[PDB]
Amino acid sequence: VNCETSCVQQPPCFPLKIPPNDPRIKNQADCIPFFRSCPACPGSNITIRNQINALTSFVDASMVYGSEEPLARNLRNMSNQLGLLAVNQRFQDNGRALLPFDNLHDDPCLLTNRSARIPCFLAGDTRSSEMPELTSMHTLLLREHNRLATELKSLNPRWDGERLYQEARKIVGAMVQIITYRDYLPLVLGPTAMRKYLPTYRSYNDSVDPRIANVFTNAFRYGHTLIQPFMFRLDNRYQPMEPNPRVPLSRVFFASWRVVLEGGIDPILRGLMATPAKLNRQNQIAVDEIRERLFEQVMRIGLDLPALNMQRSRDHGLPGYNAWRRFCGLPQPETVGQLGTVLRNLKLARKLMEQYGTPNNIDIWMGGVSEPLKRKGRVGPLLACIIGTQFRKLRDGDRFWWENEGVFSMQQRQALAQISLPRIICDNTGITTVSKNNIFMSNSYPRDFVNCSTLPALNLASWREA
Amino acid sequence: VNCETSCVQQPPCFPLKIPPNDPRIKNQADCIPFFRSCPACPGSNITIRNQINALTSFVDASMVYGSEEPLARNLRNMSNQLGLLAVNQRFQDNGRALLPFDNLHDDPCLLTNRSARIPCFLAGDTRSSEMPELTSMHTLLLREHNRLATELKSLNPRWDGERLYQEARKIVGAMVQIITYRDYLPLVLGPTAMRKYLPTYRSYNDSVDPRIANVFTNAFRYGHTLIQPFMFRLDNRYQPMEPNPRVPLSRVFFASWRVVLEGGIDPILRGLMATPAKLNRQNQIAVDEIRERLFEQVMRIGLDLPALNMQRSRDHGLPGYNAWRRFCGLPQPETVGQLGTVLRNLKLARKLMEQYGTPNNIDIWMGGVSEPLKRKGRVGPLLACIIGTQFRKLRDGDRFWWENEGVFSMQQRQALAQISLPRIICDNTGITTVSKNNIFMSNSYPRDFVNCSTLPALNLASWREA
Amino acid sequence: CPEQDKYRTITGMCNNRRSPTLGASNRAFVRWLPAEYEDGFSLPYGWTPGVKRNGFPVALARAVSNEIVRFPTDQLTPDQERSLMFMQWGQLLDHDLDFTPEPA
Amino acid sequence: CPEQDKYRTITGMCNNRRSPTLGASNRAFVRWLPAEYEDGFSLPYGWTPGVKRNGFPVALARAVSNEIVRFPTDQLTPDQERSLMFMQWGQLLDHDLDFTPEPA
Ligand SMILES: *[C@@H]1O[C@H](CO[C@@H]2O[C@@H](C)[C@@H](O)[C@@H](O)[C@@H]2O)[C@@H](O[C@@H]2O[C@H](CO)[C@@H](O[C@@H]3O[C@H](CO[C@H]4O[C@H](CO)[C@@H](O)[C@H](O)[C@@H]4O)[C@@H](O)[C@H](O[C@H]4O[C@H](CO)[C@@H](O)[C@H](O)[C@@H]4O)[C@@H]3O)[C@H](O)[C@H]2NC(C)=O)[C@H](O)[C@H]1NC(C)=O
Ligand SMILES: *[C@@H]1O[C@H](CO[C@@H]2O[C@@H](C)[C@@H](O)[C@@H](O)[C@@H]2O)[C@@H](O[C@@H]2O[C@H](CO)[C@@H](O[C@@H]3O[C@H](CO[C@H]4O[C@H](CO)[C@@H](O)[C@H](O)[C@@H]4O)[C@@H](O)[C@H](O[C@H]4O[C@H](CO)[C@@H](O)[C@H](O)[C@@H]4O)[C@@H]3O)[C@H](O)[C@H]2NC(C)=O)[C@H](O)[C@H]1NC(C)=O
Ligand code: HEM
Ligand code: HEM
Ligand SMILES: *[C@@H]1O[C@H](CO)[C@@H](O)[C@H](O)[C@H]1NC(C)=O
């Protein structure tokens, strides 16, 4: 069967057909590998096929801790009562912790550099090794967890391992919530959609469904339009880190050996802070590093991320563009002229109509990323609606939301409001100069940068058990 | 475990336990038989259990024609090109058609009178014989189809059997829709809820989900509160038809023999027209003929319909009263005092609180039928919301809704606006005096009755193909 | 689904052309609210002895019926503005809308 | 679900007391709109040769990417107001919210 090694369309495969005269895949009878997402009710002739979320929907740092009990236990250091997450026993990054290695059957990371023999990393989520910049973020939060557990242990000598782990985990989840809702979402949606979809928090509402909506799994892929064709690495003075400061993305996918053998997470984090994201524009939607060469070192041919997104939406039975516009209370363009007006680009509207025939059939990702960006935002109205709607449900429908009464004390909430990603980087790396807030806007050294020493540490006094 | 003969609680049985000092069942080792509704995805550890609708949700007279192809075929007279529904070959009602008999493994109708040997009737829906009054309605619609097919055959000589069947079926479907929305629903909901939940029809909206909501299957059971303890039969001058004019309901359930051997459907239809329904009052909710003696003749023990409704809502995982109030945008009472105000009845609120502890746990049917009825309606705010919301969806999300442009011509719609249940009765029975419209309000003979000769029949002239 | 048709299908299939099974027979009900089961996904409240619902004991359905629904039949109030046909059309209409199958 | 608790479960189970699987792992996504499949219930558009979607041919995902998404890499526009960290947090966050499993 293997959907990776053949083009036969049979369960569980749904290979992407190739158009005549493709600039890369010259044999039109071939394909791009694709496995259908697992059905929630296998083989049913009664249910309408639906897909599964393997993760907790809540913003609870489950990508760090795990969403299943056996994994969560395996990610922890059970050799003592310090409440720590297990760290790599073979390698360290200039004396700092790395994630432990995973034990996979057909480990893709080993293929990216056969001689280095560095396997994929083990994290709360299975995708931590997909790109080294992601790995660096996973490693950063693992260290912050251990840092917090250590401080809490000095603060509270009688707290056992379970208590220290849970208390540190609680702070980490709160940090991910604050960075996400205070710093990140406003820059995704823009101020107007932020006010509309995320009005001031009032209270936990046990009637708000916190589940991830099927469409969100595809709509939040808007982020693929932000990806730069290179992984940028910078030295301590934010200058190119020789001999390879700009590595093509097609050679960093699953390249866990680069974190281990090419300087650790510091060069990577600096590169993320001092390099601009790619801007989504209507005639510059997504780069060939992901469109022609996705996972090139671990697949029989390079995959196409944008195409996979569209095939996934069909696999998931997702309605077309106009149905989602309607769901969102937005006008539904029925002609090329109307589509031209909505997109403020008649040229793009014409191209979409040549491909789809009707705006009713445009795939959600394609139509979503085609819309002009909202002011001070990086998505148009449709994606703003779907994404904003989802994050309000994850906030209002979370009994453990950091601002919910009874989760943290007033003084703990005041301490947590001072956290920031720049400070977290300062506390867990050898980087001593970081971005000014907002870290997601700041992107030019030295203009947008300041000394770590100007940023106050998180005050854990109110976690001292009286 | 046999759910009908055992009280052991094991899949798929969920027997109702007997409380101490029960007025009828003094043996607490006994139980009321209950089979859990079939799950949509059997044995899943992933899906949240859901139940199945075996019928078409649309108001399309599927109870006459069937909701599956093999049955729909078997209900048709395939011995000619007249497009008729098959009629009983062994018995007639004063020269008029009866529904064909069904072929059931364990026929319950046979048990209602051993020596009569009259099996259950075969119809579009499996419950046609549950009570003789229902059978009478099924029988009435079967006759109207055949009457419509006959007139249509005269007007359009070239129409084959299939065409006649489909055209007669299309007319009957529109009749069920018209009687339901024009006559029935306003008297269920009252004027205010009718205007709020069923605003003037515009046109078919393909974004309106027409599925039956799981909650509706329990909420629409409000009708159980309208059930009288007897089946009333009246002769041609609307007088008690001797020698058994008032049969206890516990001896009419599945009593198909009464239709065949005790005078046909005319006495039954006259009884329905000239007898008041039971009014739902807060301390007169539902009668012991269904509460103590439901299906007493066809099984080991008499069931309790109100109790089954509540056990069924739990089987179906239905949220409690306050959750449905919130869904409907209605205030959610948390104390006995607040519940007293909502019900305008402190005494009933106390009984509910004693049983449930909190209005959050009141089972949907119980809470719904407990609410004071809306003015000129026969349900309270909660049920009005659930029922009104469901019927608007069955209307707006039906591509074949009778008023949808293209379904019927303007002159065909004008003709259909003249149909009525009283006229249909006039056209298909030996009854010559019937209720004035609205048939659902009129209930007193002779004050509310008129001659059939004063009601213009449906003019099918605009169905002429010419 | 046929590009064009003339009448309803018997199963209701293809009424909604974008989502062909909506309103068709032998399909799961739609949920207007998430389901509430004793274990979160399958067991009905009242299944497991001593397991409460939302902080309170689950009342036996038969006990609620005995205490709240039961009434002396001689107290019955005939509805002066509704015929018994009002009840009957209701049940007939219900049988056009839904039937929830169970094992034999 | 315990009467009281001080920390999140690992699975997300019991976050919502009335419907304890909501937001928990290894559960079906919620649908905001009914699914749209070729046969109404399972097969994706593009599966069966010749089957149109709502009157038009299903556009190959690879064709849409080639004709609409493809652009010259030297034309890339750096976002003067967003860092690549903005890209990276989004992916990290996505990995807190959803992972749609596939057979191996
Ligand atoms: C055809 O029918 C469509 C369905 O209509 C519903 O059913 C019919 C029978 C009627 O009863 C009708 O009144 C019902 O609405 C109909 O499309 C519907 O249109 C509404 C209004 O545009 C849509 O509501 C908007 O939804 C978005 C998305 O959030 C919704 O879904 C989530 C997830 O389930 C829920 O958690 C939310 O509560 C919403 O229900 C909202 O963002 C939006 O609200 C925001 O914007 C409004 C306006 O500024 C503000 O007031 C709010 O405060 C928010 O800021 C709306 O609530 C609905 O999603 C959509 N449904 C579908 C299936 O598309 C369509 O318009 C009809 N067409 C015609 C010609 O009649
Ligand atoms: C706690 O949150 C609950 C969920 O709130 C939603 O999500 C959060 C995150 C916010 O975005 C919020 O804005 C969202 O609404 C919330 O309960 C919700 O409250 C609303 C308002 O009362 C309810 O809407 C009403 O629904 C009924 C029932 O029909 C609905 O469902 C059907 C079936 O899916 C749809 O087809 C309909 O379109 C509806 O969506 C409607 O009858 C009613 O409309 C009618 O009445 C209003 C008012 O007179 C008229 O304007 C309309 O024209 C109609 O005549 C509303 O649409 C919603 O059902 C309910 N959801 C749930 C899950 O219970 C709750 O209020 C919050 N509590 C607090 C304290 O914050
Ligand atoms: C002759 C009058 C009626 C009955 C006899 C009768 C009986 C039942 C029974 C046995 C059930 C199932 C109980 C269970 O859950 O185990 C039931 C279900 C439903 N009813 Fe009944 N009913 C009579 C009359 C009415 C009237 C007048 C109704 C509405 C106006 C009404 C509705 C319903 C509904 C919708 C159901 C559920 C159907 C389904 O299976 O989905 N009933 N009734
Ligand atoms: C290092 C950058 C990124 C990738 C490499 C990458 C890759 C993928 C792939 C291969 C998929 C699956 C495609 C398919 O359907 O076969 C994918 C899914 C999702 N992404 Fe990706 N992604 C990178 C970066 C981002 C960013 C910046 C995102 C958001 C801001 C983003 C989101 C998503 C989402 C939500 C999905 C679905 C996840 C799920 O399984 O539910 N991606 N991405
Ligand atoms: C557990 O903690 C101790 C002390 O910090 C450390 O030496 C050891 O390496 C840790 N084990 C793992 C697997 O991380």
Ligand SMILES: *[C@@H]1O[C@H](CO)[C@@H](O)[C@H](O)[C@H]1NC(C)=O
């Ligand atoms: C693979 O890793 C080794 C270190 O083990 C390194 O020297 C070599 O350059 C890497 N291969 C490539 C192609 O960079």
Ligand SMILES: *[C@@H]1O[C@H](CO)[C@@H](O)[C@H](O)[C@H]1NC(C)=O
């Ligand atoms: C079919 O129709 C003919 C003509 O009305 C009738 O004589 C015959 O009995 C019918 N057959 C059945 C099974 O109803």
Ligand SMILES: *[C@@H]1O[C@H](CO)[C@@H](O)[C@H](O)[C@H]1NC(C)=O
């Ligand atoms: C049973 O049916 C017979 C007809 O065979 C009838 O004479 C008898 O009265 C019925 N039994 C009862 C109890 O009514």
Ligand SMILES: [C-]#N
């Ligand atoms: C691996 N440690």
Ligand SMILES: [C-]#N
């Ligand atoms: C059967 N007749």
Ligand SMILES: [C-]#N
């Ligand atoms: C009721 N049937």
Ligand SMILES: [C-]#N
């Ligand atoms: C992207 N994952």
Ligand SMILES: [Ca+2]
């Ligand atoms: Ca999570």
Ligand SMILES: [Ca+2]
């Ligand atoms: Ca039907």
Ligand SMILES: [Cl-]
């Ligand atoms: Cl429901």
Ligand SMILES: [Cl-]
């Ligand atoms: Cl969805």
